[PDB]
Amino acid sequence: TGNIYNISSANELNALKLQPGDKVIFKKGNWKNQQINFKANGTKEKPVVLAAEKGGETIFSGNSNLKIDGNWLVVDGFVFKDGFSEKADVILFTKSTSNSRITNSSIINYNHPDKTFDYKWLSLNGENNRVDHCDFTGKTHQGTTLVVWLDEKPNHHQIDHNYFGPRPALGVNGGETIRIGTSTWSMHDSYTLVENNIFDKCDGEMEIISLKSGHNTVNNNLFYECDGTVTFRHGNYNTVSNNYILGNGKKNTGGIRIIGENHKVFGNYLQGLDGSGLRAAISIMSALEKPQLHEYFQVINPQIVGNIIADSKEGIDIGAGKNEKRMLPPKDGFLKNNYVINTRTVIKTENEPEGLLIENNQTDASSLPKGFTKVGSDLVKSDGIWQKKNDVKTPFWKKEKIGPEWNN
Amino acid sequence: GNIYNISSANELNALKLQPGDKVIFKKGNWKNQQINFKANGTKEKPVVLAAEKGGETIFSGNSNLKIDGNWLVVDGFVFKDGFSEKADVILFTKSTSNSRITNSSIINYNHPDKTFDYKWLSLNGENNRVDHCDFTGKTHQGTTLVVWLDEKPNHHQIDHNYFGPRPALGVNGGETIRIGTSTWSMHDSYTLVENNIFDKCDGEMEIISLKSGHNTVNNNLFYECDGTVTFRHGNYNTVSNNYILGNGKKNTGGIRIIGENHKVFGNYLQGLDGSGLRAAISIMSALEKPQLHEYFQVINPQIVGNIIADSKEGIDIGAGKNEKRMLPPKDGFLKNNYVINTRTVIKTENEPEGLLIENNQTDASSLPKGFTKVGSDLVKSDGIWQKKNDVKTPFWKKEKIGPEWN
Numbered sequence: 001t002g003n004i005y006n007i008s009s010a011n012e013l014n015a016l017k018l019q020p021g022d023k024v025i026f027k028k029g030n031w032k033n034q035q036i037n038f039k040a041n042g043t044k045e046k047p048v049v050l051a052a053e054k055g056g057e058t059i060f061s062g063n064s065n066l067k068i069d070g071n072w073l074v075v076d077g078f079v080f081k082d083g084f085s086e087k088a089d090v091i092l093f094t095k096s097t098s099n100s101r102i103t104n105s106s107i108i109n110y111n112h113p114d115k116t117f118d119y120k121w122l123s124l125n126g127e128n129n130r131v132d133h134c135d136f137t138g139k140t141h142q143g144t145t146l147v148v149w150l151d152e153k154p155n156h157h158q159i160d161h162n163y164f165g166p167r168p169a170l171g172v173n174g175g176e177t178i179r180i181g182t183s184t185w186s187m188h189d190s191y192t193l194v195e196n197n198i199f200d201k202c203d204g205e206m207e208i209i210s211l212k213s214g215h216n217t218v219n220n221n222l223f224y225e226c227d228g229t230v231t232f233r234h235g236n237y238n239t240v241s242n243n244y245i246l247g248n249g250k251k252n253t254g255g256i257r258i259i260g261e262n263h264k265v266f267g268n269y270l271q272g273l274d275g276s277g278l279r280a281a282i283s284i285m286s287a288l289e290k291p292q293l294h295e296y297f298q299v300i301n302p303q304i305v306g307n308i309i310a311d312s313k314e315g316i317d318i319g320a321g322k323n324e325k326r327m328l329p330p331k332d333g334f335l336k337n338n339y340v341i342n343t344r345t346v347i348k349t350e351n352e353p354e355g356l357l358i359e360n361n362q363t364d365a366s367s368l369p370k371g372f373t374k375v376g377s378d379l380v381k382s383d384g385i386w387q388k389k390n391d392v393k394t395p396f397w398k399k400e401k402i403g404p405e406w407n408n
Numbered sequence: 409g410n411i412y413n414i415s416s417a418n419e420l421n422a423l424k425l426q427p428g429d430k431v432i433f434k435k436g437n438w439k440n441q442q443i444n445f446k447a448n449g450t451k452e453k454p455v456v457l458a459a460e461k462g463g464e465t466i467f468s469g470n471s472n473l474k475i476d477g478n479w480l481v482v483d484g485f486v487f488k489d490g491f492s493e494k495a496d497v498i499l500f501t502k503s504t505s506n507s508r509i510t511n512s513s514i515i516n517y518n519h520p521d522k523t524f525d526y527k528w529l530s531l532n533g534e535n536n537r538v539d540h541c542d543f544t545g546k547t548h549q550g551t552t553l554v555v556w557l558d559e560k561p562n563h564h565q566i567d568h569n570y571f572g573p574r575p576a577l578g579v580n581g582g583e584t585i586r587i588g589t590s591t592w593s594m595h596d597s598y599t600l601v602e603n604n605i606f607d608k609c610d611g612e613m614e615i616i617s618l619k620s621g622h623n624t625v626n627n628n629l630f631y632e633c634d635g636t637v638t639f640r641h642g643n644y645n646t647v648s649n650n651y652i653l654g655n656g657k658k659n660t661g662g663i664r665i666i667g668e669n670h671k672v673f674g675n676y677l678q679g680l681d682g683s684g685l686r687a688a689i690s691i692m693s694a695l696e697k698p699q700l701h702e703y704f705q706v707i708n709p710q711i712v713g714n715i716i717a718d719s720k721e722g723i724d725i726g727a728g729k730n731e732k733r734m735l736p737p738k739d740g741f742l743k744n745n746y747v748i749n750t751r752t753v754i755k756t757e758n759e760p761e762g763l764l765i766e767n768n769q770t771d772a773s774s775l776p777k778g779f780t781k782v783g784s785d786l787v788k789s790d791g792i793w794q795k796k797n798d799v800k801t802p803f804w805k806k807e808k809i810g811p812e813w814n
Contacts, residue, residue, distance in 0.1 A: 088503075184595070
């Protein structure tokens with residue numbers, strides 16, 4: 001069996017010599033200026049846990065920060081609120097951290113008094129780390145809420161079942177909810193999985209999720225009333241699939257913006273969107289001829305299949321963002337088996353693509369565009385979401401606990 | 409400020425340090441000290457962590473140091489009789505700016521496992537300085553001192569240090585100093601490596617590996633080093649006024665050029681035994697469409713005023729050429745260099761395109777194009793062949809190198 005240590009201070013944690021299987025229980029209460037360094041090494045069989053006595057009842061206020069530094073560690077039930085970080089990211093997974101996890105935890109309005117002061121709320125480094133059943137809400141200052149920092153090897157991190165709540169408009173770039181990589185690391189493989197999360201009113205900037213590395217999967221998430229887009233910003237071989245981007249008619253709600261090579265966009269429900277051009281439900285950007293990593297790379301071989309676009313201002317925009325510098329149009333790939341209904345502009349072409357196969361796309365538009373057919377394959381509407389009658393399913397957020405287990 | 413006297417890493421953690429304060433670590437041999445120097449100072453009043461008596465505060469066993477914050481100074485520490493279990497021995501974090509480590513040493517601080525990777529000093533952040541230190545005897549995987557690149561130039565300064573004997577590692581990753589990696593090679597670094605001694609640094613082919621741009625390696629001594637100073641990745645680097653003195657030692661190489669807009673001037677490259685990639689001045693051949701971790705074509709190298717003497721091979725244009733590396737050096741010049749008592753003045757493995765070779769002087773009977781007989785008077789002063797009108801006492805003869813207490 002394992003030892004159980006009952007503590008109420010970072011100083012007591014620092015004095016423990018933790019072994020695989022140990023559990024450190026942080027007592028219920030409101031503790032200020034806590035500098036928590038969870039530095040220990042567990043094993044697959046015997047993880048080292050740092051848990052709140054009662055989930056959501058151990059609150060870290062003032063200038064509190066958490067560092068997870070080791071292998072097979074688990075942090076569970078903590079809340080950061082009524083404070084801010086003076087410098088470091090609120091929660092950090094070190095580069096030497098692997099197979100570690102933070103669960104049932106929250107960061108709420110943990111804002112620096114200075115809006116221009118940059119820190120992230122959660123930073124992922126190392127490999128096979130997991131962020132699940134957490135709540136990150138109300139960031140008003142500079143910096144992406146949750147970042148995956150890329151390194152020379154893929155991370156294979158998992159970000160699942162979290163609630164990312166309202167994030168107000170930052171007014172400048174760096175207000176993303178999730179950023180996976182940077183331009184410098186954009187040609188590296190990341191393999192991050194972003195699954196079954198809720199992004200509710202994440203309005204920090206243009207990008208809600210900014211992908212800037214390769215082989216990432218954004219699957220089965222809900223983006224509800226988000227003033228922004230899911231952007232394939234830099235990198236190749238990314239997948240954005242089975243997500244519900246429900247704008248609910250909200251001003252400037254955008255869809256999936258495609259930049260770069262070999263990307264797959266499939267099975268998404270892109271409805272109630274108010275965006276156009278770069279904010280269309282499916283936006284396939286124009287690009288530069290000889291770009292630097294931080295610029296725009298030509299869309300090559302996009303595979304856009306089975307997406308249901310409905311009740312939106314603009315369905316697909318091919319060549320969006322075209323100008324004097326960005327003259328390269330999308331090329332290769334296919335735009336097929338999609339459905340575009342009750343949409344003011346079904347398909348706009350700002351830059352004619354090359355070899356992009358457009359076929360079997362059902363629409364209710366009076367003037368059928370090139371590559372589109374008439375709606376006949378039953379499109380039903382269960383839970384305010386226009387779905388295919390035989391593919392009707394209960395959306396993951398109606399039957400799964402998203403955010404901390406102790407919270408409702 | 410206040411003078412805090414401590415004898416433990418835990419004691420330092422309990423202090424609320426303010427600008428101008430000084431922490432004095434007690435003389436003695438302290439085992440397994442995990443030192444976390446997290447504090448902030450100012451330009452006028454820095455926070456100092458100093459040994460009670462320089463060189464008499466030893467950290468043995470599994471001891472590490474982290475310098476985390478602005479305007480911090482670490483002084484007089486010795487790391488020996490131990491090893492790191494994972495982390496780099498001395499680390500400046502990314503949040504560290506205007507901080508310094510002086511009069512400190514890391515000696516035979518080796519892991520029992522030759523394959524276990526950690527660096528002895530890692531530089532992150534901005535405007536940090538490593539000076540008057542001694543780093544000697546690394547036998548395990550990993551470069552001795554690393555400059556880790558980030559999105560902004562660091563402008564670090566590495567000066568007046570003694571990098572002592574480093575035995576041959578057997579594999580790559582045995583450099584003395586590496587500035588950057590292939591991923592960050594197109595970023596500007598602006599690191600200055602100046603007035604250091606590299607003595608028998610034999611870890612691998614690269615004593616210094618530049619893998620970022622705008623770095624300057626100036627006025628250093630490379631004495632009996634089994635390796636080269638390589639411009640490995642990146643552009644706009646400078647290797648100047650250095651003394652590479654092989655003393656005839658097997659495989660002592662010179663300066664190896666790869667990439668664009670590099671300047672190699674005023675170097676004294678003497679008693680070298682290398683050839684090909686280890687020639688006194690090697691100008692590599694490269695791939696046509698290289699990825700960042702490969703070889704970029706030498707474009708516009710400016711090689712001037714170097715004095716090559718008593719060596720096996722002077723200049724190798726097109727060194728390393730094979731089926732993959734076919735692109736030869738192009739543009740720039742090779743002028744006003746001297747090649748005396750050297751078995752091969754110039755070896756051409758790949759004819760350069762538009763490389764101007766002119767006004768180079770040699771004592772060789774057969775003159776290559778761009779070469780003339782030695783017209784200027786040369787003197788051998790302090791063991792080094794120099795122009796009689798340009799004689800200077802080498803820096804290491806008139807400056808303290810390494811810790812002041814040693």
